[PDB]
């Protein structure tokens, strides 16, 4: 540091000494400008008008230049002077973004302070190639049960969350975010902490404020940042927000740290690209979209990666989100994003209203990585669970017609109903991995078959409280060893037996 009068004033006095292109707007309309001049412009660079507004040059035609504006066009007056800065569009990076809310360009909107970050990064960048990568071997604890058991997620993966409107997409992502505060509080190893980025495209500020409130209420903002490109925010900001999020995440990916990024309403990005190209008079394709939508999503999702031990060992996981209409996944954007992801998590309204919440369909939902992104203790249970649920899904439809079946099939139905009633969860109520393991052990070894289906929702909570109170050591052992030795098997069985002795349910 330094003192004001004797040092800073001298410095500024030594600083002031100094002495010794532009264009003009030609057409204006709908948040877009067409300039004449600026023959030395880089395609994609930032441009400055004579009123403080900023823009981005995209169409370098022969006569004119096509600029998209970051705001309203009431300021531009068909003749205003325009100047190029020479910078390609870039954003700040660092830990100064953690705890803050920013627009597509890094300008904060929380209303509390500027952005303390000294290093910037280009928005559109080349993804990392084949050699500086490695296989996915670490898990990403989502906090849910059906995900962590049957659709596991690793560090370096790109898993899609696809469903209808109002099905629990944001809630899935918010629980994924909330489950990490314990993992981060119980360490100071940045190689093990997981930071988070939430890009919100098309959302309303009320919803974004509700999300920020839900996170502050749980202290889940000291390791997250948010990038809000809402509907009032212009098309180019909505178009840039996910690339800005990937730019903020590449700092973690490259600096040996880990990260997760949630693009929310990834279809509004394509809407904005359609809007831009149609107001720039570019010709459309099918569904009025351009043909560069694949190269719009590939650039973005190929930045998620797991780097090698020479490039630090970092990671950038991706969890895009998609809203379908009438469950139509035969469309263009859903098809592209399913075809360029390492898995799927489908969400349905029939299952959301039948009582299954989260309403994850574990048949269509997959994860190509799979068990490699799963703990051994969870492998042991989840293989059997997936098999049993496959059988139950096969048989239950025929069973519901009132036929009379043997006991080997009645056991299948009972166990499937038990598991289906186990995998239900409340919103903003995530669980640790060891506790998921214990609960699914109780469900798989048959300590819930005779019990009533409606009683499992309290069986679960009472067992959770019991093992959190009196058997934390088992949980610590599972958390450390990440397996189930015969000792822990026996201890868990004994604890469950004690619990069923101490307690009483309807069967």
């Amino acid at each position: 540091a330094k003192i004001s009068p004797s040092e800073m004033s001298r410095l500024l006095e030594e600083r002031i000494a100094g002495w010794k292109e532009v264009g003009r707007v030609v057409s204006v309309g709908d948040g877009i400008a067409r300039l004449f001049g600026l023959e030395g412009v880089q395609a994609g660079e930032l441009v400055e008008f004579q009123n403080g507004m900023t823009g981005m040059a995209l169409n370098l035609e022969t006569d004119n230049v096509g600029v998209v504006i970051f705001g309203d066009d009431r300021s531009v007056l068909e003749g205003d002077s325009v100047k190029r800065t020479g910078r390609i569009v870039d954003v700040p990076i660092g830990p100064g973004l953690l705890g803050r809310v920013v627009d597509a360009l890094g300008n904060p909107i929380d209303g509390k302070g500027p952005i303390p970050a000294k290093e910037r990064r280009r928005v559109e960048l080349k993804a990392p190639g084949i050699i500086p990568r490695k296989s996915v071997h670490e898990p990403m604890m989502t906090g849910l049960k059906c995900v962590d058991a049957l659709v596991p997620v690793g560090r370096g993966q790109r898993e899609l969350i696809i469903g209808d409107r109002q099905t629990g997409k944001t809630a899935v992502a918010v629980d994924a975010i909330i489950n990490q505060k314990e993992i981060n509080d119980s360490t100071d190893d940045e190689s093990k902490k997981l930071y988070c980025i939430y890009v919100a495209v098309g959302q309303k500020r009320s919803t974004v404020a509700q999300i920020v409130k839900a996170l502050e209420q749980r202290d889940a903002m000291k390791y997250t940042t948010v990038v809000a490109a809402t509907a009032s925010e212009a098309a180019p900001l909505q178009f840039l927000a996910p690339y800005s999020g990937c730019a903020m995440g590449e700092w973690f990916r490259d600096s040996g740290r880990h990260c997760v990024i949630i693009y929310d309403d990834l279809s509004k990005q394509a809407t904005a690209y359609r809007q831009m190209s149609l107001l720039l008079r570019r010709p459309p394709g099918r569904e009025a979209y351009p043909g560069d939508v694949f190269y719009l999503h590939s650039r973005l999702l190929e930045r998620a990666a797991k780097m090698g031990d020479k490039s630090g060992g970092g990671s950038l996981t991706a969890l895009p989100v998609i809203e379908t209409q009438a469950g139509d996944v035969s469309a263009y954007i859903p098809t592209n994003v399913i075809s360029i992801t390492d898995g799927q998590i489908f969400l349905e309204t029939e299952l959301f209203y039948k009582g299954i919440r989260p309403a994850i369909n574990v048949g269509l939902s997959v994860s190509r990585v799979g068990s490699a992104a799963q703990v051994k203790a969870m492998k042991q249970v989840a293989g059997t669970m997936k098999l049993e649920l496959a059988q139950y899904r096969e048989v239950a439809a025929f069973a519901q017609f009132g036929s009379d079946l043997d006991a080997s099939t009645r056991q299948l139905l009972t166990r499937g109903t038990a598991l289906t009633e186990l995998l239900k969860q409340r919103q903003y109520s995530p669980m640790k991995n060891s506790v998921q393991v214990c609960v699914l052990y109780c469900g798989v070894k048959g300590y819930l078959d005779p019990l009533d289906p409606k009683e499992i929702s309290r069986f679960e909570s009472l067992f959770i409280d019991y093992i959190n109170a009196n058997h934390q050591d088992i949980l610590k052992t599972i958390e450390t060893e990440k397996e189930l030795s015969e000792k822990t098997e026996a201890k868990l069985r004994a604890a469950v037996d004690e619990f069923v002795a101490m307690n009483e349910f309807k069967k």
Partner: protein, 180 residues
């Protein structure tokens, strides 16, 4: 680039090569003035009721009845053959600009209020030694945002030297609000 740009470049080229510059320049100026003064030649050019043969006949009778080169007549026959006669005005403007740019620039310039012959002389001689262009025909203007210090634009686009008070002041302020 544009159509009128194409015809103007072709005409400026050929008239610099063979016939002369000044002849075709005066011819285009006369045609433009007749277009903006007669107020029926313009309609004769724009209307489609006039046949191509009547057009060419009236154009040749203007050629003979007025001081007129063959290059301009060929230009008019081409514009009629390609349905580009309304672009005569634009073409003429394009021809006009190049010659005066070749010879000497006209520049804009701003003050607060009426300066004096002394500092006017100083301004013109300073801008002349800065240009090193022997011909300069300027403009005077009055905009008081730049408080009194003489701001201007020597008209070539890529040089807007902003010698002003308020502009340097605000730039300095925004510089010295820097951190440390």
């Amino acid at each position: 680039q544009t159509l009128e740009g194409r015809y103007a470049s072709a005409l400026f080229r050929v008239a610099k090569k063979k016939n002369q510059l000044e002849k075709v320049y005066g011819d285009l100026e006369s045609v433009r003035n007749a277009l903006k003064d007669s107020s029926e030649f313009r309609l004769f050019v724009d209307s489609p009721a006039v046949s191509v043969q009547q057009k060419l006949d009236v154009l040749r009778q203007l050629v003979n009845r007025y001081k007129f080169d063959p290059l301009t007549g060929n230009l008019l026959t081409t514009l009629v053959e390609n349905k580009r006669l309304p672009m005569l005005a634009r073409v003429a403007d394009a021809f006009d600009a190049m010659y005066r740019k070749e010879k000497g620039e006209v520049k804009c310039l701003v003050t607060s209020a009426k300066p004096l012959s002394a500092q006017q002389q100083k301004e013109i001689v300073a801008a002349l030694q800065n240009r090193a262009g022997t011909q300069a025909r300027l403009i005077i203007d009055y905009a008081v945002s730049p408080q009194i210090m003489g701001g201007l634009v020597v008209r070539l686009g890529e040089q807007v030297l902003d010698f002003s008070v308020a502009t340097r002041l605000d730039r300095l302020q925004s510089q010295l609000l820097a951190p440390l």
